[PDB]
Design a protein around this ligand. Structure first.
Ligand SMILES: Cc1cc2nc3c(=O)[nH]c(=O)nc-3n(C[C@H](O)[C@H](O)[C@H](O)COP(=O)(O)O)c2cc1C
Ligand code: SF4
Ligand code: FES
Ligand code: NA
Ligand code: NA
Lengths: 155, 417
């Protein structure tokens, strides 16, 4: 397993950025996930080598940090706040709307591999509850019609 | 071009931290300079580090990240130990209800950067870090760009403005763990490790990043520093009541008409926050409770308390989550239990098992499936998360829930029957 040049170049930027190589581990793992739609288990050994770290160190880090997903590939992660106060302000309605539009529940991926619903703790936008993200983009849920239009922007 | 972010409402009676950040847009360096930005830095670099520490001490500034440690005193402790030293901005803000820090980061990044540079100079740190939670991607990109702006204007790098002071600011990203806001866990994460808190003592100010003296400060804390230098510590102390001076941000959410971030003096009462500033309650329903993030539960009998650091004050980080008369307190308690279940790092046995069991058992209670032994077990676990804990999470994971048991017995009773 080898990283494509375009990805390897970015990883190398991260690794050269901090005073010590190993400090770049989370930036690198974010970069890997954004490229492949998940963290391929095969990617960890060559990442470890670039960071000058043992494989088990990198494995332990991937396991600890919730944002990283070793199991399911998805183009777009729909992170849905399942905390408080989002629960008062209509998380349930957001989840129902997502089920109506995409046919999936929290934890599931669409058959085409396009969308995965990821339940998350507070996203720090509680005044704009109920909150969700689509990869890096973050939104307030207003209604199914509004949500449907938002999701149509991700192709 | 940045990722989409919700336009959180922001209002200020003081026009300090939200002077620019009351507008939901990035204020870049040229606009910041037009407001007198970076002039406090220039002033600071003509002062001795010791004088800056003295001003920040006399300002009475205290940490805005939840523990309320006096900032100047913290800095004094760090400079008692030989360098090199490190400065860290904590932008991990991940507690339920808390969204005050992000609006500084996303809208007025140069206010934060200016504070970081001054603070770093004060403690003699030539390397500073911002650790921003992974779920704030826009904030990360905005900060990276703002830092490059500052570097191009000569406010970062070597020999800043001819002062002989060198600084670089690095931006690190978290990856989904609330515990990485705990200052020693944050340092572990910066070192490229799992975010596990360290046994204290030692404290970071003695042994922190790479075992060197390290000051960790919250975003909001740091954003006060340019004001202290610009205005002088006396003028800063005239803001708000004598005993609790300075601006404070209050993120207000739940069942209010105008949820958002309010910049207010600390003599404001909880009642005023809700009714005078945040427009009262949705449907004008009665307030049942206020959750101070995931820390404390205040009843409707406790709304006349000051939003200050006093023994009888609101305290915490000033996070105000409003529940009204129709909201189920047990359901809300379950949400808090779920948070602590998800976020314990699991190093300490009573925290690991206690956070898990508290949520597990409360879910059974909520669903009407709990046995009598489950109820007894729940009470016991709730009182026994803290033993042997080496960070604040274990100490508080049962606190709010215990307050709901004491303040809303009737509601819990319905579930027991
Ligand atoms: C579980 C836990 C989570 C914390 N999360 C944060 C956080 O997100 N941001 C923050 O600045 N402080 C957080 N703190 C407090 C920090 O440990 C530390 O007190 C603070 O960053 C110091 O800065 P200050 O003196 O400016 O408040 C947390 C503490 C604990 C125990
Ligand atoms: S108290 Fe809990 S969160 Fe803190 S170090 Fe121990 S197990 Fe981890
Ligand atoms: S509770 Fe959902 S963003 Fe905070
Ligand atoms: Na719907
Ligand atoms: Na005053």
């Amino acid at each position: 397993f080898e990283f494509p040049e375009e990805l390897k170049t970015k990883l190398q930027e991260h690794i050269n950025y901090f005073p010590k190589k190993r400090q770049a581990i989370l930036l690198c793992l974010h970069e890997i996930q954004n490229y492949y739609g998940y963290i391929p288990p095969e990617s960890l050994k060559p990442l470890a080598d670039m960071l000058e770290l043992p494989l088990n160190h990198v494995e332990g880090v991937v396991a600890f940090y919730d944002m990283f997903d070793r199991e399911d590939k998805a183009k777009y992660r729909i992170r849905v706040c399942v905390s408080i106060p989002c629960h008062l302000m209509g998380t349930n309605k957001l989840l129902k709307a997502l089920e109506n539009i995409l046919g999936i529940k929290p934890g599931e991926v669409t058959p085409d591999g396009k969308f995965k619903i990821v339940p998350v703790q507070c996203l720090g936008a509680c005044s704009e509850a109920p909150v969700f993200m689509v990869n890096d983009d973050e939104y307030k849920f207003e209604s199914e019609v509004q949500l449907n239009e938002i999701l149509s922007r991700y192709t | 071009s940045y990722p989409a972010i919700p336009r959180i409402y922001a209002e200020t009676t003081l026009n300090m931290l939200l002077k620019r950040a009351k507008k939901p847009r990035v204020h870049s360096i040229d606009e910041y300079l037009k407001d007198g930005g970076y002039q406090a830095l220039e002033k600071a670099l003509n002062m001795s580090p010791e004088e800056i520490i003295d001003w920040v001490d006399k300002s009475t500034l205290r940490g805005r990240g939840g523990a309320g440690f006096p900032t100047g005193k913290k800095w004094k402790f760090a400079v008692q130990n030989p360098g090199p030293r490190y400065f860290i901005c904590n932008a991990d803000e991940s507690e339920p209800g808390t969204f005050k820090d992000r609006i500084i980061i996303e809208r007025d990044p140069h206010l934060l950067i200016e504070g970081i540079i001054i603070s770093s100079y004060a403690i003699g740190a030539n390397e500073a870090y911002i650790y921003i939670r992974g779920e704030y991607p826009a904030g990360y990109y905005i900060l990276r760009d703002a830092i490059e702006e500052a570097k191009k204007k000569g406010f970062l790098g070597k020999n800043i403005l001819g002062s002989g002071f060198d600084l670089e600011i690095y931006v690190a990203r978290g990856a989904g763990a609330y515990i990485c806001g705990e200052e020693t866990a944050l340092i572990e994460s910066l070192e490229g490790k799992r975010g596990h808190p360290r046994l204290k003592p030692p404290y970071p100010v003695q042994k922190g990043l790479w075992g060197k003296p390290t000051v960790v400060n919250n975003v909001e804390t740091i954003a006060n520093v340019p004001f202290i230098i610009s205005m002088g510590w006396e003028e800063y102390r005239y803001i708000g009541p004598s005993d609790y001076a300075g601006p404070k941000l209050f993120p207000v959410s739940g069942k209010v008409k105008k949820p958002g971030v309010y910049e207010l003096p600390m003599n404001t009462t909880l009642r005023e926050v809700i009714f005078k500033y945040a427009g009262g309650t949705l449907g004008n329903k009665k307030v049942k409770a206020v959750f101070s993030g995931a820390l404390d539960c205040f009843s409707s009998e406790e709304l006349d308390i000051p939003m200050d650091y006093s023994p009888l004050g609101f305290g915490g980080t000033g996070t105000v989550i409003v529940l009204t008369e129709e909201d189920d307190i047990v359901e809300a308690a379950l949400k808090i239990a779920e948070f602590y279940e998800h976020e314990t790092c699991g190093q300490c046995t009573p925290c690991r098992v206690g956070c898990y069991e508290q949520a597990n058992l409360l879910e059974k209670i909520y669903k009407g499936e709990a046995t009598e032994q489950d109820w007894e077990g729940f009470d016991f676990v709730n009182r026994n998360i803290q033993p042997t804990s080496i960070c604040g999470l274990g100490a508080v994971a049962g606190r709010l829930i215990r307050q709901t048991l004491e303040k809303f017995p009737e509601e819990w009773e319905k579930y027991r029957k």
